[PDB]
Amino acid sequence: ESILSRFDADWTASDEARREAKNDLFFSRVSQWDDWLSQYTTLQYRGQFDVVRPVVRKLVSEMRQNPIDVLYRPKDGARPDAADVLMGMYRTDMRHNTAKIAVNIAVREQIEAGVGAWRLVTDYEDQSPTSNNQVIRREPIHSACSHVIWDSNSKLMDKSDARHCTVIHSMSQNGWEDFAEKYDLDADDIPSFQNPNDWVFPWLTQDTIQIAEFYEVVEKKETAFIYQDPVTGEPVSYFKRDIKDVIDDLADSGFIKIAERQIKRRRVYKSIITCTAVLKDKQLIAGEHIPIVPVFGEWGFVEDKEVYEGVVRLTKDGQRLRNMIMSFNADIVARTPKKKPFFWPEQIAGFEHMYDGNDDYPYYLLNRTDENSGDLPTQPLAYYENPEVPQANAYMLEAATSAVKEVATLGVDTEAVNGGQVAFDTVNQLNMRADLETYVFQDNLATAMRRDGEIYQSIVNDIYDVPRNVTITLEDGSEKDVQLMAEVVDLATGEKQVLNDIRGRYECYTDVGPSFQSMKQQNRAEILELLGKTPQGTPEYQLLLLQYFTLLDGKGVEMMRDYANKQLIQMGVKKPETPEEQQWL
Amino acid sequence: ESILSRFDADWTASDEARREAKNDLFFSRVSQWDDWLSQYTTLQYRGQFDVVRPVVRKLVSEMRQNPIDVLYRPKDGARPDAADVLMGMYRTDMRHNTAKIAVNIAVREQIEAGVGAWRLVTDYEDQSPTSNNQVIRREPIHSACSHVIWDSNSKLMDKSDARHCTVIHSMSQNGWEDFAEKYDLDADDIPSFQNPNDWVFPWLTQDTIQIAEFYEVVEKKETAFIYQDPVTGEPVSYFKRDIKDVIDDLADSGFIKIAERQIKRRRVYKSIITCTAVLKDKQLIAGEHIPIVPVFGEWGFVEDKEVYEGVVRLTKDGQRLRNMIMSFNADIVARTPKKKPFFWPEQIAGFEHMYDGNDDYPYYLLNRTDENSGDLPTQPLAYYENPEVPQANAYMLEAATSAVKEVATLGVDTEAVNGGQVAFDTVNQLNMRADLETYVFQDNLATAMRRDGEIYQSIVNDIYDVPRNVTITLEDGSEKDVQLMAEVVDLATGEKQVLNDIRGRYECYTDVGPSFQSMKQQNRAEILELLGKTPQGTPEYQLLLLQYFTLLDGKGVEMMRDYANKQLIQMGVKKPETPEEQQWL
């Protein structure tokens, strides 16, 4: 069934769906509103309970340190001379960026429930083409992952992995009426599902017009240097091994290629997991590049239904001990006192004057000639009831509240001293490394100064073979001024998309780890905490006046370059960026 | 049972593991969700009661204190100038933080679950089979949990024994195919292992077809070069060692070989464990090569079934009576019979509209008489509504709260030094010491800078044989372009793979160590407490400029990268290279 496949492949947990996420879904429920499900006659005035919130309100507020500022530390093994563009990465493309808060939108729902990922609009945009200018983006939305069921891998993904599998949302709107610029043929497809509801409740939208987007699903690509069985053409290979150690060169006894193998494999059938209809051909961006990534979740499991591990569910029924004040004064208070002083109001039923409190004072109802017993009293004194034995209820609430002040203890310090980093920071630190992509493996976009010259001038290079003599002008500069004398040699460096095998392009990436950043991030921050760091003395009178800035270099900070231009050469300077001048007089 | 052989080792107890399996899943389940164990008479609303959590917050604590970075200082066996050649390995080493974070749940395995599983790449280099020269680091995996039990030895983790005993992957679905890299066709192996048949029959999930990966039985290997002169002349040597002094000179007796042994592996054609099928052959080179090394916990051994690190405290009675203080507390609230004063409050016969939620007030008809009797007054209200009050339980849970204060005492610490050190430290760091792994080399064939001049066996030593005069370099020159003009230079020693018998010709082994190594501590103390170690002086005007600099490469230090080694004038010796820079200084 290769053609109709990928239906029911989600079959893992759905047989018990009568129960399903009922136990696991309450994080979006218990967050507010109401408690009872099982029992009967939980009624009257309810919905005040809540009050569990603040425990996690400390866990949301760490966002201040979430940035962890670090920018593209180069290496010395790549070419730093190509760094001219690097200094503008955060600048010349995306500069004012709101999405830094969009990380946090995921940060809360994280501890609230699983954290997903959502749709993208291509960052390759607009008009008036320009220089290199690449950085990618993703903006997390709120939830709509609720009944989404995934079985694929769901641990951690650094590299290629599964491409893209399943995206489903129930009763969103978004890009529906925005179809204008994509395809626009019919779009009446709209699969049928059982929409989440329990019993009668029809409050939601019963319109469907659903949308789902898939690419390539749970299969990968492998090549790995194929050489095989050299007789009679070898139909249907369907084989490979690795085992690198054996051979030297088999050319006389075997295969020769002198190239890489060929392309346009009809790509393995997929069908978008549907039994009805489809078209779905050649939706493709550049190469196989697809810069959209799903986000993980923190769930342990043994049985095929992954059970949460959570905080607020600890004390749920444990602190129903609070509702026992609600089970008395709000419920069984119906025992209401109805206090009657009973001694000599004859029979209790008089005219309405009694409880209306009119200005006529005398309350006398009483006259006595009573039943015949004689020489004996009767004592009504006790009357009705009381509040309930106020002892045994004391420690219950105290234990609940104690377990609550436990969750306020996390990485507790006096202050500072290698501060409060915790598990949730280590796991939540970078979606920048889920956004790690800047052509990091898939290389496409490049500077190409003016369209990289489009490599049409090569032949001209050979005009200079003229036999006569080799020499050039007199002393180097005279009128110099504008840049001139471009001759050099055959092609200097490479401009392409990833250039496949040869890697000189991998350098600048994140230092994540301790807060230490290699060059002088804290340089003058020494003074805020304690004192007594930076040495000083005469031999440092060279660069301590200059290079002691923590501010990097601005255009008014260019004074860094005034004293090192010329005179101090005998000490070696740094020989800074500026190519042209190297002279003063 | 035909030639089943070693299988009796790994079958062990598939069924009768009831006792040691049941608790084995117990300590994991009793944390988060429910405990239903032994006693009879279950009741209604249950499963929300945990109170095993706080101590685990005691257990996570400070665990991350152990980066212990180390750089550049192994045991020096050769010239340090390799900084420009091989050390690019170490210079791309820094790329990897990556899946370290994944240990968050992997170290959570220490207190409950079994052997922490760590499996690195299946074969050589995986993707990008080109110049790479990179390092060893880790990407943990989830599953060894419920059914894993190892019964053979149960002593030492470094395993001076057969190395890895057993590999078990079970109760997973997505984990069918890690094997798609090579042949990939379905429905071959289908091994059948024990199943979680628990007690009740239905088992809504039928999943079967467990898989396990494994190789050798009674593996016998070493190099085996020996001396013998029994002059009994038989094959199948059956003597493995030199019992007396031999190697020195046997010449007069005989035994002139100048060769090692030529080994095609003998072993046995039944490899590892066979129920029905068989797997693979034609692989090995040169022994060792098990780069996947799962991470282990701490176990001392007493007798037979061993209890490793105890989890938490007293839990069994204290917390199950926290659940048995729930025996009757709110359960007697339903046993409150709207306790009514008696002697004609009794309303049974009447108009019930008093109970409608609005009051509508008193019951006015009371009158009495009997035959000739005599009677006495009664006390209507007096009874026992007073319960059994947790007077004792208050200081039972508060004194037990002082016990939880006692488990809050670990590794007494204030600030700065004097941390929380315990044995768990040294066991996990013990797991990280054996993790050197591939830092140096992994022995198959060439990973090499330059080997004897491009595989050519002839001319690299042939340059100095030119007739007439062979003289040192002379005669002026202006611009030398690339240096290393060759006259008397030659090659010697050896360039090959595996190094044969000799080890220890190279610099690198594990350089990590105690709490104090880091980047540079030795010259940096200071910010810990109370400033500097060094005075100032007139002859001292050199003054530590070779020392006080702190960390690796930094932007402020650029004077050191070159000119601080360039200036020594009258002496002129700093870690000398001097191919180029200075002439007449």
Residues from chain B that touch A512, judged by Cβ atoms under 8 A, are 97
Query: Whole-angstrom Cα distance, residue B260 to residue A549?
Result: 66
Give the 3-state DSSP-derived string for B519-553, with helices as H, strands as E and coil as C. Answer: CCCCCCCHHHCCCCCCCCCCCCCCCCCCCCCCCCC
The partner residues of B116 in beta bridges, in order of sequence, read B295
- What secondary structure does DSSP assign to A333-364, as a single string? GGG-------SS-SSS---THHHHT-S-----
Q: Are A551 and A557 in contact (CB under 8 A)?
A: yes
DSSP label at residue B55: H
The partner residues of A307 in beta bridges, in order of sequence, read A300
Query: Whole-angstrom Cα distance, residue B566 to residue A504?
Result: 30
Q: Are B412 and A415 in contact (CB under 8 A)?
A: no
- What secondary structure does DSSP assign to B271-299, as a single string? -S--SS-----S---SS-------B----
Q: Which two tokens stand for residue A24?
A: 């696991």
Query: Whole-angstrom Cα distance, residue B75 to residue B508?
Result: 6
Query: Whole-angstrom Cα distance, residue A541 to residue B541?
Result: 13
DSSP label at residue A327: T
- What secondary structure does DSSP assign to B298-361, as a single string? -----SSS---S---TTHHHHHHHHTTTTSSSSTTTTT-------SS---SSS-GGGGSSS---
The partner residues of A217 in beta bridges, in order of sequence, read A163
* Degrees to nearest 5, angle at CA B298 with B295 and B303: 125
Three-class DSSP category at A509: strand
Query: Whole-angstrom Cα distance, residue B573 to residue B577?
Result: 9
Q: Are B494 and B64 in contact (CB under 8 A)?
A: no
Q: Are B210 and B170 in contact (CB under 8 A)?
A: yes
Count CB pairs under 8 A between chains A and B: 203
Q: Which two tokens stand for residue B387?
A: 């319960």
Q: Are B197 and B254 in contact (CB under 8 A)?
A: no
Q: Which long-range contacts (CB under 8 A, 24 or more apart) does A142-146 make?
A: A142/A105, A142/A109, A143/A28, A143/A109, A143/A113, A143/A116, A144/A116, A144/A118, A144/A169, A144/A170, A144/A172, A145/A113, A145/A114, A145/A115, A145/A116, A146/A21, A146/A25, A146/A28, A146/A113, A146/A170, A146/A196
Which of B439, B441, B440, B437 is closest to B120 using CA atoms? Answer: B437
Q: State the angle between helix axes of A394-407 and B391-406 in degrees (0 to 180), rounded to the nearest 10.
A: 20
Alpha helices in A212-347 (DSSP H): 323-326
Q: How many other CB atoms are there within 10 angstroms of residue A103's CB atom?
A: 19
Alpha-carbon Rg for chain A, nearest whole angstrom, is 39
DSSP label at residue A268: P
* Degrees to nearest 5, angle at CA B275 with B274 and B280: 35
* Degrees to nearest 5, angle at CA B528 with B522 and B529: 110
Which of A22, A136, A506, A293 is closest to B88 using CA atoms? Answer: A506
Q: Are A298 and B142 in contact (CB under 8 A)?
A: no
Which of B524, B521, B505 is closest to B513 using CA atoms? Answer: B521
The partner residues of A163 in beta bridges, in order of sequence, read A217
Residues from chain B that touch A38, judged by Cβ atoms under 8 A, are 44-45
CB half-sphere exposure, B243, CA atoms < 13 A: 5
Report yes or no: B362 at the A interface, CB cutoff 8 Å.
yes
Nearest CA in chain B to A548: B556
Buried b (16+ CB within 10 A) or exposed e, A470-509: eeeeeeeeeeeeeeeeeeeeeeeeeeeebeeeebebebbb
CB contact under 8 A, B416 and A414: no
Using alpha carbons, list the distances in angstroms from residue A291 to A130, A440, B125, B390. Answer: 22, 11, 25, 62
Three-class DSSP category at B116: strand
Three-class DSSP category at A205: coil
End-to-end CA distance of chain B: 87
The partner residues of A509 in beta bridges, in order of sequence, read A73
Q: Which two tokens stand for residue B29?
A: 């389940």
Query: Whole-angstrom Cα distance, residue B172 to residue B179?
Result: 15
Which of A456, A517, A566 is closest to A73 using CA atoms? Answer: A517
Using alpha carbons, list the distances in angstroms from residue B163 to A502, B170, B289, B296. Answer: 39, 21, 11, 13
Query: Whole-angstrom Cα distance, residue A437 to residue A285?
Result: 15
Cα dihedral sign for B454, B456, B457, B463? negative
Q: Which two tokens stand for residue A313?
A: 């569910």
Q: Are B493 and B49 in contact (CB under 8 A)?
A: no
Within 8 A by CB and 6+ apart from A75, the residues are A507, A508, B91, B92
Q: Which two tokens stand for residue A475?
A: 């002393």
Residues from chain A that touch B51, judged by Cβ atoms under 8 A, are 314, 318, 403
Q: Which two tokens stand for residue B573?
A: 């010796």
| The residue to which tokens 């009657």 are assigned | A340
CB half-sphere exposure, B375, CA atoms < 13 A: 12
Q: Are B413 and B419 in contact (CB under 8 A)?
A: yes
Three-class DSSP category at A567: helix
Nearest to A156 among B51, B99, B444 (CB): B99
Nearest CA in chain B to A513: B97
The partner residues of A300 in beta bridges, in order of sequence, read A307
DSSP label at residue A577: S
CB contact under 8 A, A423 and B104: yes
Burial of B199: CB neighbours in 10 Å, binned 0-12, 13-18, 19+: exposed
Query: Whole-angstrom Cα distance, residue B255 to residue B223?
Result: 18
Q: Which two tokens stand for residue A458?
A: 């090569």
End-to-end CA distance of chain A: 84
Query: Whole-angstrom Cα distance, residue B498 to residue A340?
Result: 105
Nearest to A547 among B131, B531, B556 (CB): B556
- What secondary structure does DSSP assign to A140-188, as a single string? ------TT----S--S--SSSTTB------SS--TTSTTGGGT--S---
Task: Show which of residues 532-551 on chain A sit within 8 Å of chain B, judged by CB atoms.
Answer: 532-533, 535, 537-539, 542-543, 547-548
DSSP label at residue B117: P
CB contact under 8 A, B49 and A318: yes
Residues from chain A that touch B527, judged by Cβ atoms under 8 A, are 530, 533
The helix (H) or strand (E) run that includes residue B270 is: none
Q: Are B575 and B80 in contact (CB under 8 A)?
A: yes
Within 8 A by CB and 6+ apart from A26, the residues are A313
Residues from chain A that touch B33, judged by Cβ atoms under 8 A, are 307
Query: Whole-angstrom Cα distance, residue B335 to residue B387?
Result: 12
| The residue to which tokens 């008093």 are assigned | B354
- What secondary structure does DSSP assign to B136-172, as a single string? ----------SS----S--S-SS-SSSS-----B-S-
Three-class DSSP category at B118: coil
Q: Are A208 and A190 in contact (CB under 8 A)?
A: yes
Q: Which of B49, B101, B200, B363 to mutate to test the interface with A (most CBs of A within 10 A)?
A: B101
Q: Which two tokens stand for residue A1?
A: 């069934």
Nearest to B377 among A307, A336, A379 (CB): A379
Phi, psi of B287 (to 5 degrees): 65, 180
Which of A432, A521, A419, A433 is closest to A62 using CA atoms? Answer: A419
Cα dihedral sign for A532, A533, A534, A538? positive
Three-class DSSP category at A217: strand
Buried b (16+ CB within 10 A) or exposed e, A407-416: beeeeeeeee
Q: Which two tokens stand for residue A248?
A: 């030297």
Q: How many other CB atoms are there within 10 angstroms of residue B19's CB atom?
A: 10
Q: Which two tokens stand for residue A197?
A: 């509801």
Query: Whole-angstrom Cα distance, residue A398 to residue A402?
Result: 6
Q: Are A161 and A129 in contact (CB under 8 A)?
A: no
Q: Are A152 and A12 in contact (CB under 8 A)?
A: no
* Degrees to nearest 5, angle at CA B152 with B149 and B154: 75
Report yes or no: A395 at the B interface, CB cutoff 8 Å.
yes
Q: Are A304 and A12 in contact (CB under 8 A)?
A: yes
> Counting runs of H as helices and runs of E as strands, what totals does chain B give?
10, 0
Q: Are A117 and A141 in contact (CB under 8 A)?
A: no
Query: Whole-angstrom Cα distance, residue A154 to residue A116?
Result: 11
CB half-sphere exposure, B510, CA atoms < 13 A: 13
Which of A407, A428, A426 is closest to A107 using CA atoms? Answer: A428
Alpha helices in B109-249 (DSSP H): none
Query: Whole-angstrom Cα distance, residue B551 to residue B522?
Result: 12
Query: Whole-angstrom Cα distance, residue A342 to residue A355?
Result: 15
- What secondary structure does DSSP assign to A86-120, as a single string? GGGHHHHS--S--TTTHHHHHHHHHHHS-------
Q: Which two tokens stand for residue B497?
A: 């793979």
Distance from CA of A519 to the nearest CA of B (A): 5
Burial of A48: CB neighbours in 10 Å, binned 0-12, 13-18, 19+: exposed
* Degrees to nearest 5, angle at CA A120 with A119 and A121: 135
Phi, psi of B169 (to 5 degrees): -125, 115
DSSP label at residue B514: S
Burial of A116: CB neighbours in 10 Å, binned 0-12, 13-18, 19+: buried
Buried b (16+ CB within 10 A) or exposed e, A367-383: eeeeeeeeeeeeeeeee
How many residues in total does chain B contain? 585
Burial of A436: CB neighbours in 10 Å, binned 0-12, 13-18, 19+: middle
DSSP label at residue A424: H
Within 8 A by CB and 6+ apart from A309, the residues are A298, A299, A300, B32
Query: Whole-angstrom Cα distance, residue B412 to residue B338?
Result: 56
CB half-sphere exposure, A230, CA atoms < 13 A: 10
Residue A50 Rama label (left phi>0; alpha psi -120 to 50; beta): left
Within 8 A by CB and 6+ apart from B322, the residues are B49, B51, B397
Give chain A's largest Cα–Cα span.
155
Q: Are A312 and A52 in contact (CB under 8 A)?
A: yes
Query: Whole-angstrom Cα distance, residue A557 to residue A547?
Result: 11
Using alpha carbons, list the distances in angstroms from residue A328 to A33, A317, A323, B276, B517. Answer: 21, 17, 8, 69, 65
